[PDB]
């Protein structure tokens, strides 16, 4: 549990604390092993985990993210319980081994339900068909692979539930001998995570697991990485990053549009990043969480005229060919769509150099929640109406 | 001897417990005691279940039946729709002939409160808040002068009244319009006021009397469920004739009939009939 001397861990000291080299790790074996141990906990197992000496505000933050990790992990617990129940029910009705169940085709079902119907038993035929049909949608062992792995990473990140995973007294098969398991599957899995996924802190932020100050800084760390692997020379001067090339590659961190939007001088076109790729200019905006304050946030056409001809003055770029565009990302997290159109358009990356540079994008499936779908669609307001609505 | 609904004839190989009658296992007093208690509370549990199905409200039953009706095997994800279809529409009104303009809900940032109203409906006079000139005088309430507006506008046989707009006031209006004591009503999202349309029948009004519950704001009357239940009873006959309006802890404006239905007590506002 939490003791005097326990610290919340950063990414670098998590990479330092668990660093172990070993080759053979089943992601899907270990993930489920650790998962299983957490589902075996009772609620008191979450009790003492907050670190003893901290300023009170920071303590409140850690309480928040802990409670959200626990809520997510239980929310997944019951789901997995039901899933496993369905596997067990199929294996009972068919007589097939409980391992193979997940990989079956629909062909195999059309045959099996034919058997079961022709054996006169209708109830378990329909039962089997239901079980299989939902086991098809939610059944893959990788089903939510990324957010699970981020959960476990979060748990490492707190540097408290560490030793909760080992040292249990256990029974056996018909041997039924009582022994003490000294294997810590957690330490294994986290070591594996650090060794494989380098950027996983970036991911952990993209999924909204940073509840305070979230997903902004990790985006610019990400973009800066992307640019550094794209070009041959990168200077970082303060909040501005440039190329030594003589051709235009420029990344500007302008404002934080979260506070600077509600703080002072109510304005329209408040943005986050500016990126100049050569003849293309891109304003990258992170949507505000006020559905009221979004309608302004992306720039007025007059502002785009302005920025365009201002770049034309300064960089000497021809005003004939300039293409200035907007990209506005979801407020609290980052979906696949947004990252694809960040990789593909803003930076120009062909699929193979992206898959090279960012392996984890294939496994990363996150999509917009129903609540958050409409952040993109914005209220159209008339010019004689400007005194009423923002 | 053809049999319908009886499924395979003679069932399947099932003897009764008493008839088959395997030799009775002798349990230690422990086993027997535990059997008695678990099956006693099994019966208790069942009695509970049945009572709960008996007492289920009709709305609950309908939701249940049509929830099961649409149920599929996989819990399917919601489909992405148009930019939105789900904005609550603005209630229709005519711009040219108007008591007040119907103000958009899209302007919700512009609005003020009952105390400090935002400038709107300039072409119309603005109702003033009614406050005491001295100490001994009563402390008026939007409900008090809501009722007296309506009463006086009913005595002069007017079609429309402009009346103070607060939560429980337009609550009171919706309830009266439910019972049909009032032809109609509208809130234009004007800050100060909204409008009520009165109903007359056979030459006099539909409202005999309408009275506020309290004269002050400094006095607040609480209605026990048994009191609101007494009102409903005229010497053994059920009487819904007179309506009493009240607040709930839940901020709902209810008549006394729904209140008695769910057995909640509420704070009194006004009586009308």
């Amino acid at each position: 549990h939490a003791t005097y001397g326990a610290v919340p861990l950063t990414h670098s000291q998590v990479t330092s604390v668990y660093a172990t080299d070993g080759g053979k790790v089943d992601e899907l074996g270990l993930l489920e092993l650790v998962e299983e141990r957490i589902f075996s906990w009772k609620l008191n197992k979450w009790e003492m985990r907050i670190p003893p000496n901290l300023p009170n505000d920071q303590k409140e933050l850690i309480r928040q993210e802990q409670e959200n990790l626990k809520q997510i992990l239980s929310e997944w617990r019951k789901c997995f319980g039901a899933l496993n129940a369905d596997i067990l029910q199929i294996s009972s009705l068919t007589g097939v081994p409980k391992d193979v169940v997940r990989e079956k085709n629909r062909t195999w079902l059309q045959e099996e339900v034919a058997k079961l119907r022709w054996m006169g038993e209708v109830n378990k035929a329909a039962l089997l068909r239901d079980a299989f049909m939902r086991l098809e949608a939610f059944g893959s062992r990788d089903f939510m692979f990324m957010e699970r792995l981020c959960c476990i990473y979060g748990l490492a990140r707190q540097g408290t539930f560490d030793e909760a995973f080992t040292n249990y007294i256990t029974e056996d098969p018909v041997t039924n001998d009582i022994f003490v398991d000294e294997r810590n599957p957690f330490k294994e899995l986290v070591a594996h995570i650090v060794r494989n996924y380098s950027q996983i802190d970036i991911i952990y932020d993209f999924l909204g697991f940073n509840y305070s100050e979230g997903y902004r800084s990790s985006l610019r760390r990400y973009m800066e990485y992307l640019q550094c692997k794209t070009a041959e020379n990168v200077r970082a001067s303060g909040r501005l990053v440039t190329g030594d090339k003589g051709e235009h590659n420029i990344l500007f961190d302008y404002c934080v549009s979260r506070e600077s939007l509600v703080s002072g001088d109510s304005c329209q076109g408040i943005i986050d990043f500016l990126y100049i790729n050569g003849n293309d200019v891109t304003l990258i905006i992170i949507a505000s969480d006020n559905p009221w304050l979004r309608n302004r946030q992306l720039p007025h056409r007059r502002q785009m005229e302005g920025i365009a001809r201002r770049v034309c003055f300064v960089l000497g770029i021809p005003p004939s060919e300039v293409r200035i565009r907007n990209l506005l990302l979801p407020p609290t997290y980052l979906d696949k769509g947004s990252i694809v159109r960040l990789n593909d358009i803003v930076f120009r990356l062909s699929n193979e150099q992206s898959n090279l540079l960012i392996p984890w994008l294939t496994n990363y499936n996150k999509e917009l929640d129903p609540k958050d779908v409409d952040y993109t669609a914005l209220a159209k307001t008339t010019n004689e109406e400007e005194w009423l609505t923002l | 001897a053809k049999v319908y609904g009886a499924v395979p004839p003679l069932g399947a190989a099932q003897g009764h417990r008493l008839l088959h009658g395997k030799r009775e296992r002798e349990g230690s007093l422990f086993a027997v005691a535990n059997d008695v208690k678990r099956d006693e509370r099994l019966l208790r549990q069942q009695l509970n279940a049945l009572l709960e199905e008996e007492r289920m409200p009709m709305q609950a039953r309908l939701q249940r039946n049509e929830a099961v009706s649409s149920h599929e095997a996989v819990p399917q994800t919601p489909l992405v729709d148009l930019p939105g279809v789900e904005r609550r529409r603005d209630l229709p009104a005519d711009p040219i002939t108007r008591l007040f303009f119907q103000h958009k809900g899209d302007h919700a940032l512009y609005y003020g409160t009952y105390d400090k109203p935002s400038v709107q409906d300039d072409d119309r006079v603005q109702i003033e808040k009614r406050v005491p000139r001295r100490r001994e005088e009563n402390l008026y309430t939007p409900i008090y002068d809501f009722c007296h507006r309506i009463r006086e506008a009913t005595e002069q046989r007017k079609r429309f009244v402009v009346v103070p707009s607060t939560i429980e006031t337009r609550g009171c209006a919706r309830v009266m319009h439910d019972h049909g004591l009032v032809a109609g009503f509208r809130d234009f999202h004007n800050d100060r006021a909204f409008a009520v349309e009165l109903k007359y029948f056979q030459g006099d009004s539909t409202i005999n009397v309408i009275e506020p519950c309290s004269y002050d704001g400094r006095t607040e009357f609480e209605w026990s469920p048994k009191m609101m239940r007494r009102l409903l009873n005229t010497h053994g006959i059920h009487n819904r004739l007179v309506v009493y309006i009240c607040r709930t802890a839940d901020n709902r404006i209810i008549d006394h009939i729904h209140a008695v239905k769910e057995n909640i007590g509420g704070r009194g506002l006004m009586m009308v009939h």
């Binding site: 997940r102 079956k104 085709n105 629909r106 098809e136 949608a137 893959s140 | 399917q76 489909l79």
Partner: peptide, 30 residues
């Protein structure tokens, strides 16, 4: 309804198709 020899592909193909048919079901409902 598309039956294949691969579980991943059967999975995502059938998810896609099912959603499509749901959309068409909304038009039909209209």
């Amino acid at each position: 309804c598309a039956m294949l020899l691969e579980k991943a592909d059967e999975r995502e193909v059938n998810k896609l198709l099912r959603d499509a048919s749901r959309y068409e079901d909304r038009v039909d409902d209209a």
